Scaffold this active site. Sequence first.
Site, short mmCIF file in Angstrom:
data_model
loop_
_atom_site.label_atom_id
_atom_site.label_comp_id
_atom_site.label_asym_id
_atom_site.label_seq_id
_atom_site.Cartn_x
_atom_site.Cartn_y
_atom_site.Cartn_z
N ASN A 147 -3.74 -3.50 -7.42
CA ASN A 147 -3.66 -2.10 -8.04
C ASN A 147 -1.90 -1.68 -8.42
OD1 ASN A 147 -6.19 -1.06 -8.90
ND2 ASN A 147 -6.67 -0.83 -6.66
N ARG B 109 3.56 7.73 -7.17
CA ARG B 109 2.97 6.67 -7.89
C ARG B 109 3.62 5.84 -8.54
NH1 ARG B 109 -1.92 4.74 -10.94
NH2 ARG B 109 -1.40 4.38 -12.85
N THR C 205 -11.93 -1.64 0.90
CA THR C 205 -13.08 -2.39 0.50
C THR C 205 -12.79 -3.80 0.27
OG1 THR C 205 -12.72 -2.41 -1.95
CG2 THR C 205 -13.28 -0.20 -1.04
N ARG D 13 0.91 -1.18 0.09
CA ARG D 13 -0.08 0.04 0.08
C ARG D 13 0.81 1.16 0.07
NH1 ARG D 13 -3.72 -1.51 5.06
NH2 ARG D 13 -2.95 -3.82 4.63
N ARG E 190 -20.65 -1.23 -9.28
CA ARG E 190 -20.94 -0.30 -8.61
C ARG E 190 -22.11 0.84 -9.50
NH1 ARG E 190 -15.25 1.00 -6.00
NH2 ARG E 190 -15.69 0.03 -3.63
N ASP F 243 -16.08 -1.37 -11.12
CA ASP F 243 -16.66 -0.28 -11.41
C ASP F 243 -18.17 -0.50 -11.90
OD1 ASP F 243 -13.64 -0.81 -12.07
OD2 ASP F 243 -13.71 1.52 -12.17
N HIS G 124 -9.37 1.01 -15.26
CA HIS G 124 -9.90 0.70 -13.69
C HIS G 124 -10.02 2.27 -12.76
CE1 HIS G 124 -11.20 -0.53 -9.89
NE2 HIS G 124 -9.98 -0.50 -9.20
#
Lengths: 331, 331, 331, 331
Positions: free
Chosen positions: B137, B105, B247, B98, B168, B165, B192
């Site tokens: 990710n 980035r 999530t 994380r 949702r 996505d 994404h």
Amino acid sequence: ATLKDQLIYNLLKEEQTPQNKITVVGVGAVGMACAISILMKDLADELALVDVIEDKLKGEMMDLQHGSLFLRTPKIVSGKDYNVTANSKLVIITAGARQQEGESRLNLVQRNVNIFKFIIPNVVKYSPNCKLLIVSNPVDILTYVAWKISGFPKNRVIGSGCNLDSARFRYLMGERLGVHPLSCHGWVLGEHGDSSVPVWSGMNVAGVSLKTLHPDLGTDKDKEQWKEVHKQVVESAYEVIKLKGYTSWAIGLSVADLAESIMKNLRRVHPVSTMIKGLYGIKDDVFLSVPCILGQNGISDLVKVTLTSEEEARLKKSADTLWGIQKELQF
Amino acid sequence: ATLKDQLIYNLLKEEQTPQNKITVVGVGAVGMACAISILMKDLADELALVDVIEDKLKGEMMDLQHGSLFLRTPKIVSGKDYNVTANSKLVIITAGARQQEGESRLNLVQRNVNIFKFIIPNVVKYSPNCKLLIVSNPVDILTYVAWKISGFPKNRVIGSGCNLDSARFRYLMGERLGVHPLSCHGWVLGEHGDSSVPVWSGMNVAGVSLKTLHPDLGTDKDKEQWKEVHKQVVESAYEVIKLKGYTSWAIGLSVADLAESIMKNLRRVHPVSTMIKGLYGIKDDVFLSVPCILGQNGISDLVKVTLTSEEEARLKKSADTLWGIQKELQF
Amino acid sequence: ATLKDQLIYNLLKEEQTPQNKITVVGVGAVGMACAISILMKDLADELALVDVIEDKLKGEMMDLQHGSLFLRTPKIVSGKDYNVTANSKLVIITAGARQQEGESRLNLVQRNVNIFKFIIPNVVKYSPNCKLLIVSNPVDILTYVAWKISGFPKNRVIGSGCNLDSARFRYLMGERLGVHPLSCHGWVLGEHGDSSVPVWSGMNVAGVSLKTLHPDLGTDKDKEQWKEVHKQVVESAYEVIKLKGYTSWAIGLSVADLAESIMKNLRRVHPVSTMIKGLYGIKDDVFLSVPCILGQNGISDLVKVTLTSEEEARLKKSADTLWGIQKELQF
Amino acid sequence: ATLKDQLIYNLLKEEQTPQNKITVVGVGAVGMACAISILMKDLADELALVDVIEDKLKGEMMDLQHGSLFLRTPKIVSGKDYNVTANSKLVIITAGARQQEGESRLNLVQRNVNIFKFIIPNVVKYSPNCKLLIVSNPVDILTYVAWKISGFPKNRVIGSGCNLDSARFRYLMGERLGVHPLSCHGWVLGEHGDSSVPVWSGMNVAGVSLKTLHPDLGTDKDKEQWKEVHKQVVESAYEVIKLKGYTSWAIGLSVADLAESIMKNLRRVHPVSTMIKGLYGIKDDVFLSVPCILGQNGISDLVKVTLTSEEEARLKKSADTLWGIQKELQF
Ligand SMILES: NC(=O)C1=CN([C@@H]2O[C@H](COP(=O)(O)OP(=O)(O)OC[C@H]3O[C@@H](n4cnc5c(N)ncnc54)[C@H](O)[C@@H]3O)[C@@H](O)[C@H]2O)C=CC1
Ligand SMILES: NC(=O)C1=CN([C@@H]2O[C@H](COP(=O)(O)OP(=O)(O)OC[C@H]3O[C@@H](n4cnc5c(N)ncnc54)[C@H](O)[C@@H]3O)[C@@H](O)[C@H]2O)C=CC1
Ligand SMILES: NC(=O)C1=CN([C@@H]2O[C@H](COP(=O)(O)OP(=O)(O)OC[C@H]3O[C@@H](n4cnc5c(N)ncnc54)[C@H](O)[C@@H]3O)[C@@H](O)[C@H]2O)C=CC1
Ligand SMILES: NC(=O)C1=CN([C@@H]2O[C@H](COP(=O)(O)OP(=O)(O)OC[C@H]3O[C@@H](n4cnc5c(N)ncnc54)[C@H](O)[C@@H]3O)[C@@H](O)[C@H]2O)C=CC1
Ligand SMILES: O=C1C[C@H](c2ccccc2)CC(=O)[C@@H]1Sc1ccccc1[N+](=O)[O-]
Ligand SMILES: O=C1C[C@H](c2ccccc2)CC(=O)[C@@H]1Sc1ccccc1[N+](=O)[O-]
Ligand SMILES: O=C1C[C@H](c2ccccc2)CC(=O)[C@H]1Sc1ccccc1[N+](=O)[O-]
């Protein structure tokens, strides 16, 4: 003139009262494992979540809702206020406080009583006719507390009790025999957790009593040490705590299984905690696990298990200890 | 002899391979949500978990195992060593670092690339013929990475991509319209996350195109601002992270849905990330989401969505941006 | 004491009004296919079966009951007397005769109307608040007949209508494209059977309209003759009758799917038959299929499909024929 | 470029084989009940049907195909020729003559053995590695026959046997005790027929032995005449046959239960027809039901039930009767 109105013609906007609603109170690991298992078993047409931590509560609700495409439960709601819980058939309580180092049992229990004094009357207000399923520890005492506070008849206050203990036991038994746990039968009864009682006489595959084949089973003179299966049930729980900090998946799955029997009125028999007064020479208002028939009224019946002297004495000791605590509690 | 030999007369010893084995790599919240969803949908006859945090891993394994009585997946295993993953049909990668305070980035991406440099070769070694499903990710980059390192043909490397996505999107669409999300069809494609693209032309209920009924749909002059539905998809993700910190449930459920199509060779169509080179004037080795047919050999076909110029330019800009990072990556 | 009383201690005796009860009237091949599908989808806590052939009815009841161990529907009952149907949420009518040799259209209808004159009042007497789902043919006319005789509002009278027609169409469409039917979207609307209408504008995979990629879709001069898919739907039905003598499994499954949405209040969209007066220039009391939202109160909403001139004329032509029979019926 | 080519881009062709193929031989009432039960339990990725009546066969296939939208089995095939059955994991044989009203299953031997002389080599030819699940009557005898003809090891030749008889027993027991059959444990072993043996000594609820509570259980002296429960199990087929001409739904569910354990390698225990040489001093190659552990290699283990002297004598009577028939058979 809007897009919804161009697309959809409405015949009526009546009523809308849920038919198979479940509430989970407390959205910690246990509560959410209950929620997900219940959702994936299509038990409910509405699920409600309650907690006092409002951010966590809203986030968990949203996360479940975002998976709605893959579920068959069309309404998921949450809130600190118990109006979201109205008309629930089943309310599952996992809320409470964690014990602290050095804190007595009496003091921990009293803290949870004070918590239940806020939860239970509000549950009752909005779902007067629900069944209560208590998971919060110490589960046997807190089932008593919920019964006392709610004023519900005995049949509608259920403790998860020895349901997890028995599932673990059957898992371990399965592993030793190389047989799925479904076909390995065995009952852990009495007080949930450390003082639970494995009933060796019932332990069987296809009706073949393991005790009868192996009379040393359960005794200290057993060269195969089958007693260790029960001891590993208890060790398993401490180990899971030590390794991941909490237990969630197994408890969640087990609670969902209880919910299925209750919601679909199956009248299956499960080891859960019920008012045990009048059995095994117990004369106080205590809850302990025996096999109970679970359906739409909660616990409609219980099975009277023949216990050995040692097994009886162990339940009766549990009952004495629980009543000792219970009679000092302030409601 | 033993109790087991008194109980059970064996005909056969020599055990076989599991035939529908799945592995989940990374037992964080996402991995464990994937796991519980897969177990409760009966997709696997064996489940393997891998992580680098050994205590957590064992604890999660035991907790699932303890629920075995309520499942139909007879073997759950775990380990740091990938020998536990041998002969998987499907390996789901949710492992990830994380982003830390002050980290860029590009550097975050590179740390995840370093993790896959260890994971992928190990997965390939023990399940050379599996399908890879990447969730970690940034998912589009990491799917490219997994494809490049593994050396697998592109049909066997699938990124979760815009699956969540889209799920949702359809939940929000369903709430607006008062229709179950299953009957609300809409596709979010491309990159994404923040840069994902809602394809307004395919948004429909019962084959009645929303765009045909309401031409402004998806534009700034839309009187009802249906563009906000996609804005809320992206906002949702940030809010869930803000509210609960991560999530899990929705991504877990959406991954199980993909796993079902693959494991049961259903050939349903899903928005997932695949090699897009040669489409929409994209000419670089990049992965983006389009509707793909999923089954036994992974992505066997993709659907060629007619996009508007604006829509294409958005995918093209995503492709340029992704390729730009990808060529500075150290393998 | 009885063995039961020695084994089991009773807390209270029962017995709640049925909570999730379904009735099937008519236990021929279609009725029994519905029953097994409903039973295997865990949609009911009580199933009641009615017919006029008493031994056959009893035999089917017992055969189902003997499978009770493998089911989660705890009470299966049957009888000629409708008291067994009391407090059903959903009553499925599959009773009737079939189209005879020589006998016209109006006489077959009238023989089923006579049957319905006995069934419907009996149903209404014991389940005045149930939803009615009519399957008996001609289904559009008999749904009208059930509505008139029952005196129910239109939301609570549902005809299976084009649910089967649409399933067959999507099966054929999926065979053509090499894609699962779930991902192959297409709507067959109007009158059930020979005169149904494929709505070419809605036919799509992943929201890619086939009519847009291929403007000849569904026209005479289509080089790929997609009109044959719909023609094959109709031919399929005649072929199964020729080969097997009747149809059971597909309709059984289609009905269970409708029951699922109703019993679980899903608000999914289905092509079912509903009171269509006021739409598409139709001004008579007739039931035709359009996409309807199905839930706990039956049809709460319908989708307003844009129909071409020809599509619209085909619906109006059906409505005239249907009404021309209906005005002549004797209630 | 066809519409398909415009809509769908192919990554790779070449057909793969199914992973979980099941074949049903005979599309009569039993075969099709087995089929629908298997399909609705998601056990197979391909179902193949075989029969000698070609029109019925194709009609039944089509009827199943038309329900595909509601299923998760992407390919259903049929044919007279056994090439449609290739690659089957599990092959279920339900073909042949059935009992008329009052007729013994043992009266079907000549007819059904001669049919098996054609069916079995054909099955083995195209699926040399399949498990065989024999349902055709008399099931125990034809399981022996299938084993002799096939040359398979006996683990892979399984008769549906007393799974159904035990299911009926547990249903009936459930009605008397007011408990779901799932929580009522009791075994009927031996011939699937008149000579079956109820194992009173193993009957229990929650591991509480009914025989210990009620020592006269099952005897002529029994005041509650529990032997009548077994008598009803024996007479069940005849009663249902007299009422509806045949039995289908209970066996369909029973067969699907057995198929689940096999296909998902559950290792659950079920009473199925197998060779019982070496138990209870039987030396003959007789097939009849005892509890077996069922998994991916079929019958991997036998559970050795402890029978009373009377129970064991009855089981030996069953074995003697069946062996008198089996031993005269010519191959
Ligand atoms: N019966 C059994 O077999 C088992 C019982 N448990 C018990 O389940 C309980 C919960 O477990 P965890 O989720 O891991 O603990 P947790 O502490 O993580 O979760 C508890 C939740 O209850 C909430 N809560 C506290 N007071 C509340 C109130 N007044 N109203 C509403 N919500 C409130 C907390 O905010 C928290 O979100 C514990 O007592 C645990 O010991 C756990 C495993 C098995
Ligand atoms: N594609 C999508 O739509 C979504 C993707 N995600 C992604 O899923 C990933 C995981 O999510 P979380 O579970 O919340 O993260 P997490 O940090 O809580 O868990 C990640 C796990 O990966 C493990 N891991 C790290 N290095 C490893 C290695 N070399 N081998 C094996 N395991 C290793 C960690 O130890 C940790 O247990 C993240 O990258 C996240 O962004 C999350 C939500 C949606
Ligand atoms: N809506 C659709 O898409 C489809 C509709 N159907 C229709 O379903 C109906 C039945 O089909 P099958 O089962 O094949 O017919 P069937 O003739 O085999 O069975 C009909 C049953 O209705 C019973 N019945 C007759 N009068 C009755 C009464 N007064 N009360 C209760 N039961 C009564 C009969 O005794 C018989 O058992 C037919 O009208 C058929 O056309 C069939 C397939 C599809
Ligand atoms: N083991 C059990 O508990 C039960 C067994 N049965 C048995 O199942 C068998 C079938 O019963 P039903 O389906 O009701 O009979 P059915 O008469 O409805 O159908 C039997 C099918 O077998 C087919 N068949 C005949 N010879 C064949 C061949 N040489 N190759 C392929 N197919 C062939 C027929 O064409 C027919 O379609 C009978 O032996 C019956 O006694 C029935 C109920 C339960
Ligand atoms: O797993 C658990 C986590 C937690 C715990 C409390 C005390 C000691 C250890 C663990 C709470 C619980 O009640 C169970 S369940 C449990 C706890 C102790 C002993 C046995 C069991 N059990 O269910 O088998
Ligand atoms: O929810 C998520 C948690 C997490 C996240 C990253 C960045 C910003 C916010 C959240 C990781 C993810 O990728 C998703 S999924 C996601 C993330 C951002 C935007 C949109 C989505 N989505 O799936 O719709
Ligand atoms: O399958 C069926 C069997 C039977 C039938 C009636 C008329 C002609 C042929 C067959 C009754 C039905 O209603 C259908 S359903 C049907 C019938 C005709 C045309 C199209 C359909 N359909 O549902 O697609």
